[PDB]
Design a binder for this molecule. Structure first.
Ligand SMILES: NC(=O)C1=CN([C@@H]2O[C@H](COP(=O)(O)OP(=O)(O)OC[C@H]3O[C@@H](n4cnc5c(N)ncnc54)[C@H](O)[C@@H]3O)[C@@H](O)[C@H]2O)C=CC1
Ligand SMILES: NC(=O)C1=CN([C@@H]2O[C@H](COP(=O)(O)OP(=O)(O)OC[C@H]3O[C@@H](O)[C@H](O)[C@@H]3O)[C@@H](O)[C@H]2O)C=CC1
Ligand SMILES: [Cl-]
Ligand SMILES: [Cl-]
Ligand SMILES: [Cl-]
Ligand SMILES: [Cl-]
Ligand SMILES: [Cl-]
Ligand SMILES: [Cl-]
Ligand SMILES: [Cl-]
Ligand SMILES: [Mg+2]
Ligand SMILES: [Mg+2]
Lengths: 679, 686
C-alpha cells in the first residue's frame, strides 16, 4: 500500500498510446500517408486530434459522422513496420516508474483502446509486458473511450476498486473515461495542450513522464548499501553514464556503483574512455568484463559497457553530452592534458539543449581544486567568454570523493595470456558445432517454416557465443569494500545505493591521505626493496607489518593534534586499513609505489606527517625511514638519477613550514639515512 | 573456522599434477603415443607404472635397459610434452572429479589457499587458468622459486608463510612420495590422494588422512561444511560447475519452470555442468538450443530467472534418452499420469543401458506428480516394462533395488507458454537480432609492453573473438521466456539418497505421508472446494473469481479452519502450514490460465470420509473448532455434482450418509452434520 500525496494507492492502470509510448505521433503520420495512397484525400488535423485515445471501431463512427477499415489496416501495417526497424518510441522515465510501482507492491495493468494483437506486440517489443498482471484492450470492451468501462474492467480484473488505483492517460477522451471511473487520475501532456476542463478533471498534472517520476520518488523508499554478491537490476532506464579513465578504479569499482545505481533501474549504456587499446578492443570483442573479488573467488560480470578511445573527440563529446553522471578516474599527471577534452565536452553539452553530476576520484588533498583550476583555464582558452564558463562551472555538481577500496589493473602480458588461452577454447568450440523444426504443433505450415528460418540464423549467430556462459574476461582484482563517500549537493547521489553522503570531506581526505595512502606507500617501498611483488604476501613478513604499525602510531599522534575532533576515529580507520592490506594478495607493490617523488612532495602523505610531528616535538623516526625508502625506491627500481632525487628532496624540505634549524637537520638526517641504505 | 577431525584449519595448500589435475595419466598416454611414432613399439604400461616417482635420468636408464641403449628417450619425452600441451590447450586440463566441489567448500569456509607445485611458474599459471581454478588460490609456490625442491619441506613451508599461517594450520594435498614427505616434514595436516600407483606402506603410515580419490575426500569434508539454507527468490545460482550431469524426463511446466531452478541451485557450492531435458515439442527443443539458455518469469516480482547450461533432446530419440539415463546422477520424472505407461518403456531401456554401461554410481529418481501414492504407479509400470525388455526377473529386481526412487510433494503452480506465444517471441527477438547485426557492420596501438610478434597474434585473437561473439552480444539483456511460475521454493522429498542430503532447495522427510496429508487437505481440498463455488457463480477461472469479495473471503476463511485442524494433528509442521497457507492465496489471486474443470473433477470421490473435505470437518469437530466454511465447501461439492455432472440428489445422500457413518464422531454429531449439509444444497439450486 503506497501513500502518494496522502492517498492510499493499491494499484495503477496505464494508457499505452501517448502516455507509455509516443505511438500517437506515428499513427498521426501513417493515417495521413495510408489515406493518400488509397482514397487520395488526406485526413484533416481536426479529425485526428478528435480521434486521440479512441478505439478503431469508435474512431470509425466519427469517420462516418463527418464523412476506414482498409485505410486503418494499412496505417497499422505502416505503424508496426516502423517499430520493426526503429523500435518502440518509449517515453523517458516509463521503465523507472513501472519498477518502483511494482516493487511498492501495487497491482498494475494497462487500459489501451488499441487491439490486443497490436497492444501486446509493442508491450513485448518495449519489454514492459512483464510489469502488468492484466491488460484491457479495445476489443473485449463493449463501449470504449470515453466511457469508463475499459478503466472499470481493468480495476475489476486486478480485484481492486477504481478509487484505490492510479490512472495514467494522455488523451482528452481517455481522461474522462479515467475520471468517470472515479480513480486517482494523472494527466501527461503528449500532442494536446490540456484544456481547463481537462486540467480540473485531473487530480495531478505533469509536463513529461519524467516529471511525475521525480514527484513519485519522494514517496518511494531509497534502497540501502548493496552486499558483495548482490545482483544488479534487470530492467534498464534510458540514462547514459560515463567513466573518464577505464582503469583500476573506473572499471574495477565505479562500474559496480553505476551498475547497482538506485536498485530500481540501471543505465542503458556505460561509456568508459581508455588509451589502453588492448583493454578497449578486448571488452568490445567479449561484450562484457568481470571484476575478480579474490577473497570469495567471486567473478562479477558488468554488462552494457562501451569502451572508447580518449583521443577520439566525437566519442568523448558523445559521453559528456548524453551522460547523466561522469566519474573522473585519472591520475594527477593526466588532469592538465585531459581538462582540454573535458572542457570541449561540457561546452558541447551547453551548445546542445539535465544537470550533470561530476564525480572526481583522485587521492590528493584538494583534488577538486586542481580539476576546477585546470578546467576553468581550459574552458576560457576555447570559449574566450567568462559569461558562459562561470555558468557551466556553477550549473553542474563537481563532487569530491573518498575511495577506500584497493583495486588492481591486469598487466597487458597477463591479458594477452588470458586471450591466447581463451582463444584456443573458442577454436575448439567452433569445431564442436559441425552442422528443421518438424512436428507441426498448433501452428500453420507457413509459421512453422518461418519459425525454422528464425531459429536457424539465430542459432547460426548465437551458437558461437554459447561459450560465454562459462567464459569470462577478468581485467580487475578488487577487495570487497562497497561504500564510496561523496560530497553533498547533487540530488542524484541521494538515491544511488553504493554512494554515502558526508559533510566535511576535506577533513576525511586529509586523514585518508596521511594515515591510509601514506602508510600504504611507505610499506610498499619497504616491501619492494625487501623483494615482495604482493602487498598481501609482504604483510606476512613480521618486519613489514611492525613497520606499518610503527608508522600508524607516529601519524595518528600527529593527526590527533591537527584534528582533535577526529582523534576518536583514527584507531578504527588505522585497523580497517591493516585488514584491507593483510589479504591483498593480488594487489601489487608496483601500483601502490607509483610516482614516489609526487608522494614525497611537501604537501603530501609522507612529508606533511613528518613536518607536523617535528613542530609538536613528536617521534618521526619511522616516518623518516619511509621517506628515505621512498627516494631509495625511486633511484633503484624506477632509475630517476640520484642527482634529481636530492634536488627534489632539498626543494620539498625548503617548502616545509619549519625553521631553518629544523629544515637543515631534516635534510641532514634524511640524506644520511638514504646513503646508509645504498651502503 | 573450518574444523576438520578436531583440528582447526585456516589454510589449504594443493599439489597440482596428480592431486588437482589428471595430468599423470595424460603423460602415460602421450609417452605411449610418442613411442608408437618414433621407435614403432609403444612403451609398456608396466614400464610407465615402474617410472612413477623416479627422476627423468633413472626413467631414461630403465628405458635403455629394456628397449636398447640407443633408444631416443629424450626425443620421445620432448614429443610427449608437445602432445600434452597441444591436447591441454584445446580440449582443456583434465580436472580430478570433485576438485571444484572441494575448492568452493574450503573457500566459502574462509580458508586462505595456495598451490605448491614442482612445475615452472609460467606453465603452472597457464594450467590453473586453463582449468579455471586460479581464482580459488591466493598465492602459488613453484619449483623454480625454492633453493631445495621436494622432498625438502621448503616449498610447503614457503607457501604456508605467504598465507600468514604456520604449516600445522594448513591442509596439504599430495599424490607423490616425495611431495607427501615435503608436506609431512613441514608439519601440516597431510591428505594423501591415490592417482595411478597404489601408495607404499611407508606413505600410508606417514599421511594423516588417505583417500582413493578426490570424491572420497569430498564425502568426508561434507561432514564438516554445512548444508546451505532454503534459497530466496532472485538469489543467484553458484558460478562454479561440478562434473555431474542431471536429467529432467519431461521438459514441461513443472520440469522447466521449477525443477530446473532446484537443480540450478544444487548444494550452493557448485551446480551440474549439463542439465538434459526431454520433450516432444520441436519448437521448444530447437529454440532453447538456439539461445543455449531459457528464462522463467515470476509475475509477482517481474523477475526473469535465466536457467543456463541447458541441453534439450527429443523424447522419441533413443540414443539421446539413453545418454540421459547413462550420464545423469539425478533424474526428475515430470510427466503427466497418462504418459507414465507409454514412457515406462524408455525408462526401462534407459535404466538397463545404465546397468550394461561401464554409471557405476546409483541414480536418484524424483517422482514429480500431484497424485496419492504416485510412486506406486511409476514403480508398477516400470516393473512390467523391464521384464518385457530383459526377460530376467533377477536383473529386473536388481535395477529396481539398486537406484533411489524418491516420492515428492510440490506446491509451485507453473504455466508452460503456448506455441503461438513462442512464435510471437521468436519473431520479435529475431527482429532485434537484425537491428543489432546492422550495427556490428558499423586496431591495437603501440603497446610498448608486448613484443611485436605477440602484438600481431593478439589482433588475430580479438578479431576472431569479436567476429563470433558480437552477434551474440544482444543476449546480455534478451531472455527467452518459456515459463510463468509462482514464488514457492521448497520441494519435499523422501529421505534416503545421499545425493539429496546437501541439496539446499530440498526439504528431506522420513515419510512423505505427513506433507502429502497437508497437500491433500490444505491445498488440493481448498482448491477443489473454492473451484466448486467459482463454477456455480459462473466464473471462467479462479483467477477471475477472486475479484468477487465472496469468493476471496471464503478462500481466506476456509484455509484458516483447515490450518487450525492440521496444527493439532501435525504440530511438527506448524511452520510449513503457515508458509503453504499464504502460498496458495497468492497463486489463486491471478490463476487465470488453469480452469475450474480439472480441479473440480470427480467431486463424488473428493467428498469421501478419509479424503481432503470430510476428514478436515471430523478433525475440527473432534477438537471443537469452527467448521462452518468447510461444511459450505462440502455442500458446493454435492451441488456441483447434481448441476454440472448431472448426478441424482438421491445418489448424493446415498454417498453422503455412508461417509458420515465412517467418520470417528458421536451418533449425535453425525445426525447434526447431515441435517445442516442437506439444507445448504437445496438452496444452491435457487
Ligand atoms: N586503485 C585504487 O586502489 C585507488 C585509486 N584511487 C585513485 O584513482 C585514480 C585513478 O587511477 P587508477 O585507475 O587507480 O590507475 P590506472 O593507472 O590503472 O588508471 C588507468 C586509466 O587511466 C587512463 N590514463 C592514465 N594515464 C593517462 C593519461 N596520461 N592520459 C589519459 N588517460 C590516462 C588509462 O587510459 C586508463 O583508463 C588515481 O588518481 C588514484 O589516486 C583512489 C583510491 C584507491
Ligand atoms: N504445474 C503445476 O501446477 C504442478 C504440477 N504438478 C505435477 O507435475 C506433472 C507434470 O506437469 P507438467 O505441466 O510440467 O506436464 P507437461 O504436460 O506440461 O509436460 C510433459 C512433457 O513430457 C512430454 O510428454 C512432453 O513432450 C512434455 O514436454 C503433472 O502431472 C502434475 O501432477 C505438481 C504440482 C504443481
Ligand atoms: Cl603467454
Ligand atoms: Cl611476493
Ligand atoms: Cl618518480
Ligand atoms: Cl566435480
Ligand atoms: Cl505434488
Ligand atoms: Cl486427484
Ligand atoms: Cl463424480
Ligand atoms: Mg491515448
Ligand atoms: Mg604430484
Amino acid at each position: 500500500v503506497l501513500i502518494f500525496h496522502g492517498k492510499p494507492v493499491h494499484g495503477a492502470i496505464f494508457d499505452m498510446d501517448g502516455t507509455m509510448f509516443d505511438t500517437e505521433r506515428l499513427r498521426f503520420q501513417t493515417l495521413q500517408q495510408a489515406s493518400q495512397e488509397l482514397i487520395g484525400q488526406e485526413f484533416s488535423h481536426e479529425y485526428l486530434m478528435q480521434c486521440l485515445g479512441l478505439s478503431a471501431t469508435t474512431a470509425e463512427k466519427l469517420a462516418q459522422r463527418l464523412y476506414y477499415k482498409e485505410i486503418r489496416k494499412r496505417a497499422d501495417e505502416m505503424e508496426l513496420e516502423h517499430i520493426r526497424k526503429h523500435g518502440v518510441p518509449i517515453k523517458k522515465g516509463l521503465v523507472q516508474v513501472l519498477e518502483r510501482l511494482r516493487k511498492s507492491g501495487l497491482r498494475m495493468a494497462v487500459a489501451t483502446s488499441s487491439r490486443r494483437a497490436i497492444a501486446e506486440e509493442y508491450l513485448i517489443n518495449a519489454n514492459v509486458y512483464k510489469f502488468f498482471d492484466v491488460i484491457t484492450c479495445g476489443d473485449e470492451v463493449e463501449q470504449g473511450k470515453p466511457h469508463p468501462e475499459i478503466f472499470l474492467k481493468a480495476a475489476s480484473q486486478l480485484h481492486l476498486d477504481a478509487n484505490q488505483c492510479l490512472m495514467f492517460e494522455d488523451s482528452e477522451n481517455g481522461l474522462t473515461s479515467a475520471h468517470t471511473s472515479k480513480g486517482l487520475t494523472i494527466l501527461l501532456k503528449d500532442i494536446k495542450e490540456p484544456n481547463d476542463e481537462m486540467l480540473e478533471k485531473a487530480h495531478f498534472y505533469y509536463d513529461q513522464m519524467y516529471d511525475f517520476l521525480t514527484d513519485l520518488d519522494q514517496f518511494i523508499p531509497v534502497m540501502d548499501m548493496p552486499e558483495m554478491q548482490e545482483p544488479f537490476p534487470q530492467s534498464l532506464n534510458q540514462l547514459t553514464v560515463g567513466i573518464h579513465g577505464f582503469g583500476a578504479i573506473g572499471g574495477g569499482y565505479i562500474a559496480q556503483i553505476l551498475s547497482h545505481w538506485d536498485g530500481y533501474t540501471k543505465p542503458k549504456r556505460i561509456i568508459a574512455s581508455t588509451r589502453n587499446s588492448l583493454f578497449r578492443e578486448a571488452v568490445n570483442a567479449f561484450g562484457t568484463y568481470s571484476i575478480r573479488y579474490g577473497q570469495f573467488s567471486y567473478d562479477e560480470r558488468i554488462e552494457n559497457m562501451s569502451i572508447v578511445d580518449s583521443d577520439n573527440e566525437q566519442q568523448m563529446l558523445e559521453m559528456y553530452t548524453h551522460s547523466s553522471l561522469i566519474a573522473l578516474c585519472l591520475p594527477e599527471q593526466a588532469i592538465e592534458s585531459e581538462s582540454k577534452i573535458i572542457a570541449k565536452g561540457l561546452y558541447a553539452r551547453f551548445n546542445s539543449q539535465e544537470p550533470l553530476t561530476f564525480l572526481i576520484i583522485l587521492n590528493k588533498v584538494g583534488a577538486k581544486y586542481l580539476v576546477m583550476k585546470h578546467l576553468k583555464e581550459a574552458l576560457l582558452e576555447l570559449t574566450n567568454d567568462e559569461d558562459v564558463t562561470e555558468h557551466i562551472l556553477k550549473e553542474h555538481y563537481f563532487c569530491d570523493t573518498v575511495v577506500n577500496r584497493m583495486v588492481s589493473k591486469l598487466s597487458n602480458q597477463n591479458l594477452y595470456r588470458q586471450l591466447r588461452i581463451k582463444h584456443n577454447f573458442l577454436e575448439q568450440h567452433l569445431e564442436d558445432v559441425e552442422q528443421e523444426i518438424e512436428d507441426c504443433n498448433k501452428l500453420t505450415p507457413d509459421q512453422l517454416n518461418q519459425a525454422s528460418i528464425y531459429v536457424d540464423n539465430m542459432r547460426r549467430n548465437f551458437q558461437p557465443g554459447h561459450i560465454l556462459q562459462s567464459m569470462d574476461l577478468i581485467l580487475f582484482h578488487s577487495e570487497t569494500d562497497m561504500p564510496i563517500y561523496v560530497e553533498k549537493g547533487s540530488p542524484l547521489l541521494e538515491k544511488l545505493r553504493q554512494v554515502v553522503l558526508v559533510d566535511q570531506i576535506t577533513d576525511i581526505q586529509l586523514i585518508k591521505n596521511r594515515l591510509w595512502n601514506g602508510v600504504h606507500a611507505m610499506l610498499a617501498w619497504y616491501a619492494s626493496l625487501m623483494g615482495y611483488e604482493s602487498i598481501g604476501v609482504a604483510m606476512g613478513d613480521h618486519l613489514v607489518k611492525a613497520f606499518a604499525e610503527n608508522l600508524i602510531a607516529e601519524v595518528k599522534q600527529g593527526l590527533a593534534i591537527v584534528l582533535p575532533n577526529y582523534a576518536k576515529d583514527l584507531d578504527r580507520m588505522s585497523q580497517s586499513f591493516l585488514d584491507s592490506c593483510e589479504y591483498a594478495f593480488k594487489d601489487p607493490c608496483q601500483r601502490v609505489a607509483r610516482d614516489p617523488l609526487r608522494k614525497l612532495n611537501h604537501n603530501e602523505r609522507v612529508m606533511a606527517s613528518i613536518a607536523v610531528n617535528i613542530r609538536h616535538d613528536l617521534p618521526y623516526k619511522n616516518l623518516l625511514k619511509g621517506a628515505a625508502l621512498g627516494y631509495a625506491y625511486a633511484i633503484q627500481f624506477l632509475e630517476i638519477e640520484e642527482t634529481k632525487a636530492v634536488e627534489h628532496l632539498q626543494q620539498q624540505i625548503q617548502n616545509l613550514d619549519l625553521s631553518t634549524a629544523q629544515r637543515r637537520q631534516l635534510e641532514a638526517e634524511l640524506v644520511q639515512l638514504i646513503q646508509y641504505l645504498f651502503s
